[PDB]
Write a protein that binds this ligand. Structure first.
Ligand SMILES: Nc1ncnc2c1ncn2[C@@H]1O[C@H](COP(=O)(O)OP(=O)(O)O)[C@@H](O)[C@H]1O
Ligand SMILES: Nc1ncnc2c1ncn2[C@@H]1O[C@H](COP(=O)(O)OP(=O)(O)O)[C@@H](O)[C@H]1O
Ligand SMILES: CC(=O)N[C@H]1[C@@H](O)[C@H](O)[C@@H](COP(=O)(O)O)O[C@@H]1O
Ligand SMILES: CC(=O)N[C@H]1[C@@H](O)[C@H](O)[C@@H](COP(=O)(O)O)O[C@@H]1O
Ligand SMILES: [Zn+2]
Ligand SMILES: [Zn+2]
Lengths: 290, 290
């Protein structure tokens, strides 16, 4: 009835109790150097700050999540960490059941619970956050796949002539549209800035920042097209701090109406924010303990 | 128990009885001019050549198939035909039940019946034929989607700087890897030839034909990668006359091993050939009459 939720990410490693709402939120510095020891200690402190306060642990986590292990498809999103015994480290601190699930899959399970269930049977949530991640609901069932890969739509093809992605594959969507991909360009400018800063020189109509935010949305627009015509998607919410940025969804919708109408789809802002992973894992774990 | 199967395509409009094997095959000229009248008359003749010989009709057909209508996503694959009352025209000639299904979805349902069902739960068949088509089995269930679009993987993104596709979208996989896409290049040569001819100047190591068959496989290789990492696919058979061409699958497998191993997948030749659509529709219709 009472859940300890963790949203492990590249930037955000959240934690919260989910009674039926979020409460007692925390938000640690997801470590970017000495990360193997750093994540053991963070999982230790957070597990201590809540002992006896929960009946199960629900972990939404960046990376492929499979038999308790976190395999980082893109190690650049984890300070270099290729792998991590996620469930084990957590079990060193509590006896309660522990469910684990990719972070984007957890959000898509959250956002899907706000949808008219027989108007919308195929659904996709797209986070444009640190990287680019997704989860795929088909016939109301969240897809995870036999290895927990299903949903890793940020490493589908964006441009066969584009940047090498941190995963080793050329031209991924993540390598072109992600917060990381934006920052790789905006740091090397004569007038450097971080992603949030790119979004405001964008609104002031700086050529450079607009060309860069457009490159990202046009790629996300193409991702949605691929999704619509491959799986017959009926609605797409997009989350993440770049996705939820102001004026971005409009730029996606704009680039999406260059496509034959058949590729179009209803797109909405994620209605759960930085708390979609927590809430998703909390409900998704609970519903596969029944 | 006795089925009249039709495989409607861009080049091939087949027909056959499926008792439990194919028999009495036919193979008409899929008309490329005056096609609306042409397809009514072909559906008339074939329905007459078999009256009383079947208990139901099963139609595998190129195009989105939805409430009896064939909507051509790419009208160039149908001699211009944007739409066709497929089921209606067939009902003008028999009282028996009539099931309809996209052609690539029908093949993927065939080929999937030859698979170890709990070694392989996510499966994809890719036809590299006139165009590029697919069907997606997830958790042993063939995906069609609420509008029969699911599987139209030939109109996912291949190159955002490539040819406009006959569907209206820039850079589709079909526009780069299909038999049509090959022929559009090999006709305009100083020494023109058809696709089959491209595959033999290829084997004799003609620069031009190799550059062209490589462009197609490298794109199919990228499609498989997208499929593996999006949906956690476990095996992929590829059919169609370009797919089944000799030395092509090897070129796909070759370009696929440039990818991080996580993107790799077991790939096999389709083991049903020009009869996968017929057999697929025949079994798939029968199993959704129970
Ligand atoms: N308010 C914001 N506006 C635009 N970009 C942001 C904003 N906040 C964070 N970002 C960028 O988004 C990325 C982090 O996304 P976020 O969802 O917060 O992290 P996580 O991947 O852990 O879920 C970073 O690249 C960051 O620069
Ligand atoms: N033996 C072959 N070898 C190479 N290419 C072929 C061969 N036969 C047909 N093609 C080409 O494949 C395309 C037709 O594929 P096919 O599966 O026969 O038709 P359909 O789309 O109706 O199922 C055409 O472009 C044709 O040029
Ligand atoms: C470590 C890793 O390879 N993660 C991949 C996904 O599994 C993840 O869901 C996505 C978004 O995660 P986020 O950006 O941290 O929110 O980023 C990456 O593509
Ligand atoms: C008319 C039309 O838009 N058809 C599309 C698909 O539905 C079809 O399955 C695929 C392969 O069909 P084939 O090449 O005729 O075998 O080609 C096209 O992309
Ligand atoms: Zn990648
Ligand atoms: Zn197309």
């Amino acid at each position: 009835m009472r859940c300890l939720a963790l949203d492990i990410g590249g930037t955000k490693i959240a934690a919260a109790i989910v009674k039926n709402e979020i409460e007692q939120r925390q938000q640690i510095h997801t470590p970017r150097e000495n990360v193997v020891e750093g994540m053991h200690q963070a999982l230790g402190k957070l597990l201590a700050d809540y002992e006896g306060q929960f009946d199960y642990v629900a972990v939404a986590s960046t990376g492929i999540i499979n038999n308790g292990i976190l395999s980082a498809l893109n190690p650049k999103n984890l300070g270099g960490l290729a792998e991590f015994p996620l469930k084990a480290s957590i079990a060193k601190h509590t006896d309660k059941p522990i469910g684990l699930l990719n972070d984007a899959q957890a959000a898509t399970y959250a956002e899907y619970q706000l949808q008219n269930f027989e108007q919308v049977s195929n659904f996709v949530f797209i986070t444009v956050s640190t990287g680019v991640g997704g989860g795929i609901v088909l016939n109301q069932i969240l897809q995870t796949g036999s290895r927990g890969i299903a949903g890793h739509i940020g490493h589908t093809l964006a441009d066969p002539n584009g940047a090498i992605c941190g995963c080793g594959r050329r031209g991924c969507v993540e390598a072109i549209a992600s917060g990381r991909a934006i920052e790789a360009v905006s740091s090397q400018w004569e007038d450097p800035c971080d992603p949030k800063e790119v979004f405001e020189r964008f609104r002031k109509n700086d050529e450079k920042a607009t060309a860069l935010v457009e490159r990202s949305a046009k790629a996300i627009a193409n991702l949605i097209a691929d999704l619509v015509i491959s799986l017959d998607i009926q609605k797409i919410a997009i989350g993440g701090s770049v996705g939820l940025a102001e004026g971005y969804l409009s730029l996606v919708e704009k680039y999406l109406q260059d496509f034959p109408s058949i590729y179009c789809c209803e797109i909405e802002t994620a209605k759960f924010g930085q708390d979609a992973g927590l809430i998703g894992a909390a409900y998704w774990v609970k519903d596969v303990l029944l």
